[PDB]
Protein backbone atom coordinates (compact mmCIF):
# COMPACT_ATOMS: atom_id res chain seq x y z
CA UNK A 1 0.00 0.00 0.00
CA UNK A 2 1.48 3.33 -1.11
CA UNK A 3 0.32 6.51 0.58
CA UNK A 4 -1.73 4.76 3.26
CA UNK A 5 -1.56 4.41 7.01
CA UNK A 6 -0.82 1.79 9.64
CA UNK A 7 -4.15 0.03 10.18
CA UNK A 8 -3.54 -0.99 13.79
CA UNK A 9 -3.14 -4.56 14.94
CA UNK A 10 -6.09 -6.84 14.17
CA UNK A 11 -8.30 -3.91 13.11
CA UNK A 12 -8.92 -5.66 9.72
CA UNK A 13 -9.86 -9.07 11.10
CA UNK A 14 -10.75 -10.67 7.76
CA UNK A 15 -7.33 -9.85 6.23
CA UNK A 16 -5.17 -12.91 5.64
CA UNK A 17 -1.58 -13.35 4.52
CA UNK A 18 -0.85 -16.19 2.14
CA UNK A 19 2.53 -17.70 3.02
CA UNK A 20 4.73 -20.13 1.11
CA UNK A 21 7.82 -19.62 3.24
CA UNK A 22 7.19 -15.85 3.08
CA UNK A 23 4.20 -13.56 2.57
CA UNK A 24 3.30 -13.42 -1.11
CA UNK A 25 -0.33 -12.28 -1.36
CA UNK A 26 -3.29 -11.15 0.66
CA UNK A 27 -6.74 -12.70 0.90
CA UNK A 28 -10.04 -12.29 2.74
CA UNK A 29 -11.67 -14.73 5.14
CA UNK A 30 -15.30 -15.24 4.08
CA UNK A 31 -16.26 -18.04 6.53
CA UNK A 32 -14.47 -20.30 8.98
CA UNK A 33 -13.11 -22.51 6.22
CA UNK A 34 -12.71 -20.37 3.07
CA UNK A 35 -10.57 -17.52 1.82
CA UNK A 36 -11.04 -15.43 -1.34
CA UNK A 37 -7.95 -14.21 -3.14
CA UNK A 38 -6.75 -13.39 -6.68
CA UNK A 39 -6.23 -16.19 -9.19
CA UNK A 40 -2.89 -14.65 -10.08
CA UNK A 41 -1.87 -15.55 -6.50
CA UNK A 42 -2.31 -19.26 -7.21
CA UNK A 43 0.49 -21.58 -6.14
CA UNK A 44 0.68 -24.97 -4.40
CA UNK A 45 1.74 -25.25 -0.81
CA UNK A 46 -0.11 -22.26 0.68
CA UNK A 47 -0.34 -21.69 4.42
CA UNK A 48 -3.05 -19.20 5.32
CA UNK A 49 -2.03 -16.86 8.17
CA UNK A 50 -4.95 -15.31 10.04
CA UNK A 51 -4.79 -12.84 12.91
CA UNK A 52 -1.61 -11.22 11.64
CA UNK A 53 -0.29 -7.75 12.20
CA UNK A 54 3.52 -7.95 12.07
CA UNK A 55 4.12 -10.80 9.61
CA UNK A 56 7.70 -11.26 10.89
CA UNK A 57 6.88 -11.53 14.65
CA UNK A 58 4.60 -13.95 16.49
CA UNK A 59 2.49 -11.50 18.49
CA UNK A 60 -0.19 -13.75 19.94
CA UNK A 61 -3.30 -13.70 17.77
CA UNK A 62 -2.16 -15.72 14.76
CA UNK A 63 -3.75 -18.83 13.36
CA UNK A 64 -1.63 -20.64 10.77
CA UNK A 65 -3.68 -23.15 8.76
CA UNK A 66 -2.61 -24.95 5.60
CA UNK A 67 -4.78 -24.91 2.54
CA UNK A 68 -6.39 -28.19 1.58
CA UNK A 69 -7.64 -27.10 -1.85
CA UNK A 70 -7.41 -24.08 -4.13
CA UNK A 71 -9.96 -23.35 -6.88
CA UNK A 72 -9.03 -20.81 -9.52
CA UNK A 73 -12.06 -19.35 -11.32
CA UNK A 74 -13.01 -21.59 -14.28
CA UNK A 75 -12.67 -18.66 -16.69
CA UNK A 76 -9.51 -16.99 -15.30
CA UNK A 77 -7.28 -15.65 -18.10
CA UNK A 78 -3.79 -14.85 -16.86
CA UNK A 79 -2.95 -12.69 -19.87
CA UNK A 80 -5.84 -10.22 -19.41
CA UNK A 81 -6.46 -10.96 -15.71
CA UNK A 82 -10.17 -11.34 -16.48
CA UNK A 83 -11.85 -13.29 -13.68
CA UNK A 84 -8.92 -12.78 -11.29
CA UNK A 85 -10.42 -14.68 -8.35
CA UNK A 86 -9.66 -17.89 -6.50
CA UNK A 87 -11.04 -19.70 -3.47
CA UNK A 88 -8.85 -21.40 -0.88
CA UNK A 89 -10.21 -23.98 1.59
CA UNK A 90 -8.52 -24.34 4.96
CA UNK A 91 -7.59 -27.81 6.27
CA UNK A 92 -9.29 -27.00 9.58
CA UNK A 93 -11.81 -24.31 10.51
CA UNK A 94 -10.47 -21.03 11.85
CA UNK A 95 -11.52 -20.02 15.34
CA UNK A 96 -13.61 -16.87 14.90
CA UNK A 97 -13.35 -14.07 17.50
CA UNK A 98 -13.05 -10.21 17.30
CA UNK A 99 -9.55 -10.26 15.85
CA UNK A 100 -10.23 -13.15 13.37
CA UNK A 101 -13.51 -12.73 11.56
CA UNK A 102 -15.09 -13.26 8.22
CA UNK A 103 -16.17 -10.45 5.91
CA UNK A 104 -19.61 -10.50 4.26
CA UNK A 105 -20.06 -11.00 0.54
CA UNK A 106 -21.98 -8.28 -1.29
CA UNK A 107 -25.65 -8.65 -2.02
CA UNK A 108 -25.43 -5.72 -4.45
CA UNK A 109 -22.54 -4.24 -6.47
CA UNK A 110 -21.05 -0.99 -5.30
CA UNK A 111 -21.19 2.28 -7.24
CA UNK A 112 -18.58 4.72 -8.31
CA UNK A 113 -17.88 7.17 -5.41
CA UNK A 114 -18.34 4.51 -2.72
CA UNK A 115 -15.60 4.74 -0.11
CA UNK A 116 -13.70 1.57 0.62
CA UNK A 117 -10.86 0.22 2.73
CA UNK A 118 -7.94 -1.48 0.92
CA UNK A 119 -5.30 -3.25 2.97
CA UNK A 120 -2.17 -5.35 2.73
CA UNK A 121 1.52 -5.97 3.30
CA UNK A 122 2.62 -4.87 -0.16
CA UNK A 123 5.27 -2.36 -1.16
CA UNK A 124 4.87 1.10 0.32
CA UNK A 125 6.93 2.85 -2.35
CA UNK A 126 5.86 3.25 -5.99
CA UNK A 127 8.98 1.57 -7.25
CA UNK A 128 10.74 2.67 -4.92
CA UNK A 129 10.91 -0.57 -2.79
CA UNK A 130 10.08 -1.00 0.93
CA UNK A 131 8.00 -3.83 2.39
CA UNK A 132 6.28 -3.23 5.67
CA UNK A 133 5.99 -5.70 8.50
CA UNK A 134 2.66 -4.40 9.86
CA UNK A 135 -0.61 -4.18 7.97
CA UNK A 136 -1.19 -1.03 5.94
CA UNK A 137 -4.53 0.53 5.00
CA UNK A 138 -5.84 2.97 2.44
CA UNK A 139 -9.27 4.59 2.21
CA UNK A 140 -10.17 5.07 -1.43
CA UNK A 141 -13.22 5.59 -3.60
CA UNK A 142 -14.43 3.45 -6.47
CA UNK A 143 -13.93 5.29 -9.75
CA UNK A 144 -16.39 5.52 -12.62
CA UNK A 145 -16.25 2.82 -15.28
CA UNK A 146 -15.66 5.47 -17.90
CA UNK A 147 -12.62 6.95 -16.06
CA UNK A 148 -11.31 3.39 -15.48
CA UNK A 149 -11.57 2.52 -19.17
CA UNK A 150 -10.06 5.82 -20.19
CA UNK A 151 -7.07 5.15 -17.88
CA UNK A 152 -6.54 1.66 -19.31
CA UNK A 153 -7.87 1.56 -22.88
CA UNK A 154 -8.82 -1.85 -24.07
CA UNK A 155 -8.10 -3.57 -20.75
CA UNK A 156 -11.06 -3.11 -18.38
CA UNK A 157 -13.67 -5.83 -18.50
CA UNK A 158 -17.07 -6.03 -16.82
CA UNK A 159 -15.36 -8.08 -14.10
CA UNK A 160 -13.02 -5.20 -13.06
CA UNK A 161 -13.33 -1.81 -11.45
CA UNK A 162 -10.87 0.96 -10.65
CA UNK A 163 -10.44 2.51 -7.23
CA UNK A 164 -8.05 5.13 -5.92
CA UNK A 165 -6.84 8.55 -6.93
CA UNK A 166 -6.09 9.71 -10.50
CA UNK A 167 -3.60 12.27 -9.16
CA UNK A 168 -1.30 9.50 -7.97
CA UNK A 169 0.36 8.88 -4.63
CA UNK A 170 -2.18 6.52 -3.05
CA UNK A 171 -2.71 2.94 -4.28
CA UNK A 172 -2.27 -0.74 -3.62
CA UNK A 173 0.90 -2.38 -4.94
CA UNK A 174 2.81 -5.58 -5.41
CA UNK A 175 2.30 -7.83 -2.44
CA UNK A 176 -1.18 -6.46 -1.76
CA UNK A 177 -2.45 -8.74 -4.58
CA UNK A 178 -5.36 -10.91 -3.58
CA UNK A 179 -6.35 -8.73 -0.65
CA UNK A 180 -9.56 -6.96 0.19
CA UNK A 181 -11.43 -3.92 -0.95
CA UNK A 182 -14.23 -3.56 1.66
CA UNK A 183 -17.00 -1.01 1.31
CA UNK A 184 -19.73 -0.60 3.96
CA UNK A 185 -18.83 -3.97 5.47
CA UNK A 186 -18.93 -5.91 2.19
CA UNK A 187 -16.08 -7.42 0.19
CA UNK A 188 -16.49 -5.62 -3.16
CA UNK A 189 -13.01 -5.99 -4.62
CA UNK A 190 -9.83 -8.05 -4.77
CA UNK A 191 -6.45 -6.36 -5.39
CA UNK A 192 -5.71 -7.41 -9.00
CA UNK A 193 -3.43 -5.20 -11.12
CA UNK A 194 -2.29 -1.75 -12.19
CA UNK A 195 0.50 0.04 -14.09
CA UNK A 196 3.22 0.39 -11.50
CA UNK A 197 1.78 1.71 -8.24
CA UNK A 198 0.39 5.11 -7.30
CA UNK A 199 1.11 6.55 -10.74
CA UNK A 200 -0.80 9.49 -12.13
CA UNK A 201 -3.78 8.43 -14.21
CA UNK A 202 -3.16 4.75 -13.44
CA UNK A 203 -5.45 3.78 -10.60
CA UNK A 204 -5.66 0.36 -9.07
CA UNK A 205 -7.74 -2.30 -10.85
CA UNK A 206 -9.76 -4.70 -8.76
CA UNK A 207 -11.76 -7.85 -9.34
CA UNK A 208 -15.49 -7.05 -9.15
CA UNK A 209 -16.54 -9.48 -6.42
CA UNK A 210 -20.31 -8.93 -6.77
CA UNK A 211 -20.18 -10.74 -10.12
CA UNK A 212 -18.85 -13.87 -8.41
CA UNK A 213 -21.11 -14.35 -5.40
CA UNK A 214 -23.18 -17.09 -7.02
CA UNK A 215 -20.04 -18.99 -8.03
CA UNK A 216 -18.53 -18.54 -4.59
CA UNK A 217 -21.63 -19.78 -2.80
CA UNK A 218 -22.17 -22.80 -5.02
CA UNK A 219 -18.48 -23.71 -4.91
CA UNK A 220 -18.46 -23.62 -1.10
CA UNK A 221 -21.70 -25.64 -1.00
CA UNK A 222 -20.10 -28.54 -2.91
CA UNK A 223 -16.49 -28.47 -1.67
Ligand SMILES: [Ca+2]
Pocket residue numbers: 052053054055056057058059062
Ligand atom coordinates in the same frame (compact mmCIF):
# COMPACT_ATOMS: atom_id res chain seq x y z
CA1 LIG B 1 2.68 -12.08 13.39
